[PDB]
Design a protein around this ligand. Structure first.
Ligand SMILES: [Zn+2]
Lengths: 46, 36
């Protein structure tokens, strides 16, 4: 059950937003990565 | 100097990413003594 964000540093699916902060859960690190769609993406191999 | 949770070792990888300023601080050793 889900993904939304990721911790640049301590590697660990977080998921949160607004009044929530912009930090973490078990590394106190202020940098976050958005995380891949599930819409599937296709490539021509050319 | 942080936004809240405050004052922290900075490595260069984060300063780049955070638009930070890879700085250190300066402390002097000051003296009051009296003369007018
Ligand atoms: Zn973290």
């Amino acid at each position: 059950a889900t993904l939304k964000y990721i911790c640049a540093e301590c590697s660990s699916k977080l998921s949160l937003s607004r009044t929530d902060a912009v930090r973490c859960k078990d590394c106190g690190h202020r940098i976050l990565l958005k995380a891949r769609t599930k819409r599937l993406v296709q490539f021509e191999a050319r | 100097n942080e936004s809240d949770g405050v004052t922290h070792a900075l490595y260069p990888q984060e300063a780049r990413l955070r638009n930070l300023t890879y700085s250190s601080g300066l402390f002097v050793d000051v003296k009051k003594r009296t003369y007018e």
